[PDB]
Paper text:
The ArthβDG_[name] exhibited no catalytic activity, whereas activity of mutant ArthβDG_D207A was severely depleted. In the case of ArthβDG_[name], only a slight change in character of the active site was observed —similar to previously studied loss of function mutant ArthβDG_E441Q.
Furthermore, it exhibits additional transglycosylation activity, it catalyzes synthesis of GOS and HOS, for example: lactulose and alkyl glycosides. The functional dimer of ArthβDG has two independent active sites. Each of them is located on the top of TIM-barrel Domain 3 and is constituted of residues from both subunits of the dimer.
Residue numbers in the entry:
A (entry chain A), B (entry chain A): 24 to 1010
The structure:
Amino acid sequence: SLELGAADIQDLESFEAGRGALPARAYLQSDAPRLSLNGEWQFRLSPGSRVAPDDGWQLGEALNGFESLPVPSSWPMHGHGAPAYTNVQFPFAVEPPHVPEANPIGDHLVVFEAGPEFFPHALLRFDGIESAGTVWLNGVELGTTRGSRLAHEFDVSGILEQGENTLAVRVAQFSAASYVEDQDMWWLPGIFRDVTLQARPAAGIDDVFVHAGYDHITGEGILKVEASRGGQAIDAVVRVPELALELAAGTEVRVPAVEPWSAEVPKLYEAAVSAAGESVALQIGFRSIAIEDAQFKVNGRRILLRGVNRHEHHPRLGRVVPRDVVEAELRLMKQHNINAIRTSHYPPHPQFLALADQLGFYVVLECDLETHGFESAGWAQNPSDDPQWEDALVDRMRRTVERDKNHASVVMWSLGNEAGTGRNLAAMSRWTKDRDPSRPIHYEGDWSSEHVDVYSRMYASQAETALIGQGIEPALNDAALDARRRAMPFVLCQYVHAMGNGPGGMSEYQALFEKYPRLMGGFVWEWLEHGITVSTADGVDHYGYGGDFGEEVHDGNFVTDGLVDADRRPRPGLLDFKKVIEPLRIDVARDWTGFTLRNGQDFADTSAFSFRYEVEADGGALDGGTVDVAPVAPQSETVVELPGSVAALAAGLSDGRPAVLTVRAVLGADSAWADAGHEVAWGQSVREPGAPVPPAPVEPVQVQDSELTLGPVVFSRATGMPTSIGGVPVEKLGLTLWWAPTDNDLGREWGGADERPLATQWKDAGLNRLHTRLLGISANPGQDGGETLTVRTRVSAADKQYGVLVDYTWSTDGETVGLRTQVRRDGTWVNRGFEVEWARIGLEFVLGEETELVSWFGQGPHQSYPDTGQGARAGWFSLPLAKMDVEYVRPQECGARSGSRSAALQLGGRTLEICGDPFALTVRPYSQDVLDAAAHRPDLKADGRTYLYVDHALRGVGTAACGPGVLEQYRLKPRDADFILTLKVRS
Amino acid sequence: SLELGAADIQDLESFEAGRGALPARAYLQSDAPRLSLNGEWQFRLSPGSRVAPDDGWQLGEALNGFESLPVPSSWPMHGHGAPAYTNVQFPFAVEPPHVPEANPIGDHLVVFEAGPEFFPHALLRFDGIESAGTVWLNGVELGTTRGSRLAHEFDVSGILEQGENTLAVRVAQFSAASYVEDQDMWWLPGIFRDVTLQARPAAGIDDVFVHAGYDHITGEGILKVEASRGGQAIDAVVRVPELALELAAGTEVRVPAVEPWSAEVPKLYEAAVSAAGESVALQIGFRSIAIEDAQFKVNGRRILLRGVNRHEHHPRLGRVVPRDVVEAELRLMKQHNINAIRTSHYPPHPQFLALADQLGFYVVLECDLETHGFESAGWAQNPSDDPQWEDALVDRMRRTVERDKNHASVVMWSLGNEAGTGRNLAAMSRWTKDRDPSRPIHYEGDWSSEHVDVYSRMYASQAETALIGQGIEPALNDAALDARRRAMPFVLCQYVHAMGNGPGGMSEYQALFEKYPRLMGGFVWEWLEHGITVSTADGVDHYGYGGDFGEEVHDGNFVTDGLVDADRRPRPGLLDFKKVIEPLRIDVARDWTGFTLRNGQDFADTSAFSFRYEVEADGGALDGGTVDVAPVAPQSETVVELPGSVAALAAGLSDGRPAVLTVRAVLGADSAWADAGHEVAWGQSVREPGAPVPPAPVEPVQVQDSELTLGPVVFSRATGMPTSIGGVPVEKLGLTLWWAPTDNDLGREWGGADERPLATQWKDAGLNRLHTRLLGISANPGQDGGETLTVRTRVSAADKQYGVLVDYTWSTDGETVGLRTQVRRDGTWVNRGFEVEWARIGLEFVLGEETELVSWFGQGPHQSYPDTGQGARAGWFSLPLAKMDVEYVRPQECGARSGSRSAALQLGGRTLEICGDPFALTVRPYSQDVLDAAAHRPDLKADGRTYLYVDHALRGVGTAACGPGVLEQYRLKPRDADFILTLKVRS
Ligand SMILES: OC[C@H]1O[C@@H](O)[C@H](O)[C@@H](O)[C@H]1O
Ligand SMILES: OC[C@H]1O[C@@H](O)[C@H](O)[C@@H](O)[C@H]1O
Ligand SMILES: OC[C@H]1O[C@@H](O)[C@H](O)[C@@H](O)[C@H]1O
Ligand SMILES: OC[C@H]1O[C@@H](O)[C@H](O)[C@@H](O)[C@H]1O
Ligand code: NA
Ligand code: NA
Ligand code: NA
Ligand code: NA
Ligand code: NA
Ligand code: NA
Ligand code: NA
Ligand code: NA
Ligand code: NA
Ligand code: NA
């Protein structure tokens, strides 16, 4: 046997869970001496095991080819190799347990000093290594690590020396473990979490298991704190000063009156567990979880999960998320009404749990297991059902549970994600149920739900969710399993996929969640986009995605699919989600005399809120103030009278004059996660402006050689289009039926014989390449000598027989311009045997000047489409042109403001005003073809023009990239239509 | 009605065949004064009718914005606008008869002088205007033209002035006529054929209709020459000096003994038809066409059509083909055994016919009609069935027939191409049959063949052609139509689509054509690639295709689909076609004592040929000479003894020594189309070399730290691959299963539930991204202390479970290296539910040095794949590296030499020799990924390496871009395989 590297590769191809580590235990804050070894290490990268040197480097002499690297790190984020993104597909041939030849091997080394406090006994702790580590201390092999987001500890007693020590870690990117770590995220090798030296004093505490239940009938806590050393129960004293408790470890007691823990009221009691040589600090939250009557209950009450799936990602540091970023993003979640987190799809940093305990989230804590890439071969060779993987998979679940078992915020254990079905998942479940019966088990991969306590699905349609909510879903074939599952509460562990413009359809899910007790709620996919910061030539920063790093196989921008960008800037979808899940419902009376208030919280009353009202009209705020609301109990509702001045305004206002009454619930005092005045919920009553009044057509049409003039409008006799309106240059006016496809429009709509993405249906139909033919121009009798001008056109596409006849009828009294647009189908809009859907029925004005400011009356300030925009409230808004856009990583249709009644564009010295029955408003400095063609934001370029879109109809955006497409009521099928606009130019 | 251009557009949207022209007539050479107005004209381009100026330009004063342009021209070939390519799809919305707003309008003007010989009567002739012309002379509108490849004449009597005249022509690119001119070719507006002034003397001859039949029983000609003036029969004298004839026009006579016209013997008699004021010169070919017993017969004999479809294209002049290019390309056709031409899909230049008469081609003369783009809407609005188009379509057929009716070479009239079915096609057929019953009618669009005389199909499979050949195809539903069609002879008006690497499957068609009398033969699609010369930045010329000129809709390189490139350089497919259709069959005896000779001609014996033999061995030609063959009658065969020295050589040669006997039929004397010695047919008998002798494995394996040495081979212990062989640096050695897709591999294979193109099946399966894992390296006992080296690998692709185990076993005696390769499937090669086919089973050697020369024993000199290479004969060949490639416009797999037994690559100072059982040999200066990625030839770049491909198996190339894919016997399904090679390096 003559090839090199055979021994290294045999270890990497091992089915075992690594070797030499201490037993799995909790992460515990203790008074034992601790030394962080984080800092600047030395690093050397080789392309595979067979050429990785065996040159004595572990002794830190002859450091040929090492350079400085921070640890913790995801090494490709610091110029060593490159990040690589795949969703489902493995980036290596699928032949477990074998590894590819191209397998980055990273050799890490650090020299440190240990004082006498680390003797005689100490350990080394590694909180994460992707994917396989071998650890040496002073040349002595301690062992190996498997389970990339799991902790490993190694005893260094007798190996650690007083004074200088040399720690060496060889890390392989790929190993047999990669076959069970196929999460949809970047592949990023490294020592990416803390490395810590911990003294282990005699008579200490190795592990602690807190049991802190709550009896909602009596108000009592039920407390038992187990403590062990070396795997044996030990005498320790547990002290809980706030509850006046001093008790022995290992004894169960009843605490007469505790305040229970929930995400809404995350009450924690400080406790210490003390042995003669070591003391552990704990935060204890008393809460009990029960499944009863097909409901998921905490402390005796059904809860509603308002969740997100949280990955660990940083755009410049990879899997290393700095603590201040964690703290800020959790506050941002609370500020957007989120109360639940799924740790997709692996345990988080160990210090994450205390923050979730403190700030208050219901946490689904998920084991590091996903074998999704085996699905394409019908799950042949799936690790989850292969006996050779049993010890490895049970070890993952054991380490997951042991680390985090003391945290009140963890309300469910999850076995993993998209790992199919099989005997090893059943083993993991059995192990967990035996070890910790206090928490229900979650796993979506096995729909029969045989080895779980809740029924979990991902992206089940609103329709199917409604059936499950009513308990009337189709039965399993096994009647015993059906009876069990039909009696389980139901959770969407992932739903309303938040990629790009979207997600649509959130309100239809939320109405079900709030109506049906069996529906626990849902976790959006996902919290964050995994953008990675890159720069073009000339150094414009932007986010990159799959394929931007030279990957042979990748999944493009499917990793940029979140509610916030990688720097935690909200996408519009987060603003809408906040409103959809708001925990108070405020229904303002149409006569402005009061509002109905529903408290949708599970435990807290409304005493934390201040209730504010404001009345706004075109001239500004007319009135505002606070109203005193007696605290409303959870799940209750009341009517609140508004002060009489508000109704008096409603009475006085002229008919047709717009006015907006807004009632808001804000924090009355600072919380841990937001300041006093932070808005939690709102409701509105709107007095809509009257429909626009088209002008009297008293101005005649003036005929020149090549132009026509009608009041302030000049028209080309060659095209029938205006060339200027009140001095504003017009380069083009035409009908629009299409938009630059969203990420959702690039997804297939499963169901229906046509499974082309909508973007492809549009391209096949020519909707992205429409052309206009002029049929005629004629003047007609107006009023008092005036005339109207009718321009008749037909819109179609090359090689197609279907079209729409579009008639524009222009009128003017010299100041206001009336524009009537009439659209009539000419031939059936069917292509390749399927009906052609439209994006919109609208007009595109291309103006020959740049727009500085856009103002409108409608919804805002952010974008809104028919099935989104919940967070866009009624009002008057004004934005610089640049802020009308949405900085999605792949540019796509975005920025429409649906429900507009009036708009004003400032174009230098003139203002173009537009009024209509509800229309969508979009304004861009580049064309739709530039938007569509652009793959990254630097591809967008302003051309000195204004592209103004006025839509009479729009389709929704749905979630077709993953899950339901646009629901029927928001789809736009071809139809005939007519609509009126008025236009005015002020100088 | 206020829009501009309404009158111009109404004329362009007219269904009528234009106006003001003289009656259609023949193109006739006459002694009447003629003046060509070709030369430098003045030209002005406008973007559409509505802005085209009406500024008096037709009077040639105030020439604001005109510049010089040659006429004839296709104006986009001279920098005015751009060529645009579509295949089927129309480049404008389909709403006949309406035209798009973007419609290039070209205003042409020339001033010329007319002498007194053009008075009192003269006409102006236009032999082609694409697509709509309006003609003025001295400001007087003469009329308009429709039918872009048809002639129009206008009477200028009373309008032409003695002295200076001003001719003005406004030409619109698009008109209602564009809907009936949807040929797959470039859209190219212009005045693209001759413009001629012709005097019309009193007592002249306006039209002539030659009727020249042949009675094959008596050998007599049957002659009647009709002559008219002003639509009335006239007294004229017909003189045919060579036949001693002086006869009256309008009288039918029997000529006692003529020599009949055929493509093989294109006998023409010079004749003159004379009235008092004008004389016409004619070339008369006596031939009669008959359909009898389901056979297409000329002069009493069934013929075999060896055809091509000929478009008119020039890479720099567009639809203008210079006469010297026409003459040369026709000679090139004859030089490649072609005897028939279809004028796809419009009449050719009027002077083309005399050349076809003279050089000898059977011509299918096709009317300018194609409505293919209506098929996508189920032929809704198809002009061919719309009564409004009847006069326009009958006018096209009338002008087609009248122009060319006197030419012996025209043996069938065709109504058009891909125009569906309908009443107007039936009218065209009825008109033609009434006017000229001497020629059968062709039209493939109506398979029922109700209004035609032959059954025509395009790209019918070899299988279906065999059924039709035997008269056993499925019946039509109408038994009367079935009886008629089953009694028709059958022609493939298009077959073996010649796009890119290919066409495969030609031999299977040819065997049928020669076996079954009902099969008339076939016309390849097509003669030429319509490449257009363009240049990159830095000025490297290359051909462009669809999309290279900014087209919104286009069909890419589907216009580069010919046997020759646009400059008439042969593609390999033409060299193979020449051999497939060779009109003599030479079958050399295996004992080299003689050959069987079949004369496959229809009329001529073999007396025109000299029969040559040559014997070649490794050292060169051993013997050669001529053999006297008594002339063999058409459709007969004989055995010819070879001189005894040839057999004596066969006897003397050592067993296993390679030797090639070639017998060739060459022209014994110059012809009109080639020189004496031009090769027409050949046959060979080959004494194959013995299989290679692997060396005795007497050399041991030497083990170094990171390398192994086995005789002259050095191996990496990290990869198992050789790093040098006899000092030749080796960068990579690995298995190949894939090739850079051909144009055919990009086509769908209709039939079978999998209609992905093969290229897509390969991409989905990862065949374009294979990776290799090393399993082990070990030495084994050899002979006399020597050892063999076995390297075990596995080849697969990321995210796939299927692989192939590949074992390489190396041996050496210090000079020769033996390489045994064993391939074993590991898992089923099925992806997406369908079996994955392979391109090949071979090896890729990447050498670290450039190759100057490639020599081999096998077939050549050009490329050969399993279902091609008919023209590649056995022999020894040697080419510079650059000449191994094939300059297809879109680079793709090409250049393999199948059937190789030995190869030698000169790499500077060393020669690498390879021997094997038959293998395919390819050598390139760039990798397969560069080849695949390249869209035009300048994308290819040499990287300083040599890419050497040795294939044990290859698949065929088929014709899947249009018509049959690879036939079953040439497909390469996954299998297990083993093969031996020997390698030697000479310095
Ligand atoms: O973004 C697509 C998503 O699809 C789900 O099936 C998966 O569980 C998620 O991890 C993510 O990949
Ligand atoms: O102010 C009410 C709060 O209720 C919590 O349960 C939630 O996590 C917060 O996001 C906020 O909605
Ligand atoms: O190259 C594809 C070919 O397809 C045929 O159907 C057509 O008759 C030809 O003109 C050419 O378009
Ligand atoms: O030399 C025989 C010749 O026969 C003709 O019919 C044919 O057009 C030529 O290409 C050549 O084959
Ligand atoms: Na619920
Ligand atoms: Na994703
Ligand atoms: Na209050
Ligand atoms: Na809204
Ligand atoms: Na885009
Ligand atoms: Na035949
Ligand atoms: Na073509
Ligand atoms: Na002879
Ligand atoms: Na051959
Ligand atoms: Na290519």
